[PDB]
Amino acid sequence: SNAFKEAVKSVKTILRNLTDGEITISAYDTAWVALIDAGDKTPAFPSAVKWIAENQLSDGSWGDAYLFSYHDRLINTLACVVALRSWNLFPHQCNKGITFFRENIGKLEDENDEHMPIGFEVAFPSLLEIARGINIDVPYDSPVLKDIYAKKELKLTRIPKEIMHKIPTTLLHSLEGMRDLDWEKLLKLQSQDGSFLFSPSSTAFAFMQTRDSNCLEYLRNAVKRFNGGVPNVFPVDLFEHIWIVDRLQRLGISRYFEEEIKECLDYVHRYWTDNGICWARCSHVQDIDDTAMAFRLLRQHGYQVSADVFKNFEKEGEFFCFVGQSNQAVTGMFNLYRASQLAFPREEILKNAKEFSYNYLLEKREREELIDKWIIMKDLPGEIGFALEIPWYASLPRVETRFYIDQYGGENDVWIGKTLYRMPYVNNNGYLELAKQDYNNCQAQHQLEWDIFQKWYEENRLSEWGVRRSELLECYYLAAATIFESERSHERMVWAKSSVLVKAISSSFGESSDSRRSFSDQFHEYIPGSVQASRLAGVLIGTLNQMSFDLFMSHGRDVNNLLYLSWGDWMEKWKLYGDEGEGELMVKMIILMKNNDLTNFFTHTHFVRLAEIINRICLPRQNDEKEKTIKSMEKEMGKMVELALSESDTFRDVSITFLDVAKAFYYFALCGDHLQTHISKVLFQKVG
């Protein structure tokens, strides 16, 4: 007991105390740092030397202890051996590394599945030549190595080295492998924290060549922050802030951290620029992955961000991770896809982005190529598959969350830079535990109400009023998958019950003006065909009364009058034309059942404008004519997204309710023919 509360607390302290990043140490990078000469032929950073000796793995290698990769182990180990030997320190660990290297170098190509660390083919041979330079006894002539030495010389002939010296590029992240270097020019492309593109190793190499004091400071700060070691990229503050918020929302638990998340997004917004962003604040080089994620979250939470930010990544209708490079990672395109779906109608560049990323991912799934360069994830195919299957316009919170809890790798995910690395605050088993418990608690609540909802259906003999059992479950499902919180049962239930009653009335009396007239008369008279019209009316009136009573008994709020007015307003329009304003009725019901006083907005202009949009979306449930219908909903929803997202956090509760109802209808229009598995997972299959 309270274990849950105390776990929310520990996640809150994490969020409150985020700095420049919780990222694991890179042995490769701290080796480069350890090589630095203080000047008097002693290490400038003895604590980096110490870290290396202290963190060697049991088999003599250095690297990620939980995910073995020959590439990762060998480059990490060779670097550490070089560092220790060049100072003749810690000969015992230095000897173990050498043995490991001797015995495993021939296994470099033994893994079909392994990813390559970034820039391995230039970085590996370069520290090989450093090792040979200090007479380290290692098989420099290992057959596997002939192939990677050739690859290096060719990589280098292709590098735009002159451009590398004139403008900031990703190449600055890996200088330690290159040869023709003009430091007078490069130092002008130094980052504002003194690093060369937030790489300690590239920066360490630069310091050895220039003795530049700003490089030293970057190194000093990092070495200190990490007690001797350094990561392979730092800072990683935007990356971490953004990814933490994305994961908490998708895990379905973000509502516990609304204050903390708001503060994270303010931080991010603070460092947003018209060119976008990268993983670290104050960069001259941006990437589409970080930009698309920040863009999506900022816009989603009411920040004003422009889509012109994506213009720089666009070339000839295609989109790229980095300006001036051809790289197009699956995860970046995935995040681009997600971002593009929050486009306002005026934003052409996002239409093109959406068109491009969708087809990119589509093709890559068809080809069996959903593998990413930047990360090793539990279930990338499943995440992409979901995204392609379920547009944001049709993405109900519980549905996305139910699948993602199954996809989230927790602490098992591994990121890929110059070496393998982890992000403990993004990929965290604790978040998952919390997510599973919270999901299961809410689900249990939903099952209770499903049982109540069925009894209600039976007691009122609604099956004889033309409501099928399959329709009953679908109605409850849409409400619960949207308004899912345990403490929001009144909103969830009024919506589910209202939609059912609307379907019964429409099926039993919607056929013609007379029957509709017949029914509305009875409703008002109550408060052959006229006898039963009175019966159904009693069901409506009956359940309306029960609901307001329960609200009154638990929250003191009396909503009787507004309740009947709303139903009254709907009855008149339907009377005259048939079902036309169901969407609006649902929204009003939900707002009424809220434990607030938002009903005063029913008057506001903003409210009215949203009402007419939603009524264009929520069609009176009725091949090629289908594409038309769905495409038309999207255009109307495009307008609603704009209106709703750009809202002061007072009326926002209302605007968001319009979106919720709209998405539900959209989802049903799109997927309503094959919901059985979704419903089963969301409502009836426990997580874990």
Ligand SMILES: C/C(=C\CC/C(C)=C/CSP(=O)(O)OP(=O)(O)O)CC/C=C(\C)CCCN(C)C
């Ligand atoms: C500057 C970096 C990459 C170099 C450019 C690349 C990879 C080109 C691929 S081509 P290549 O593999 O051929 O490389 P070369 O061998 O040519 O140097 C990325 C450093 C940032 C991180 C690690 C954090 C990522 C955060 N988030 C976006 C995930």
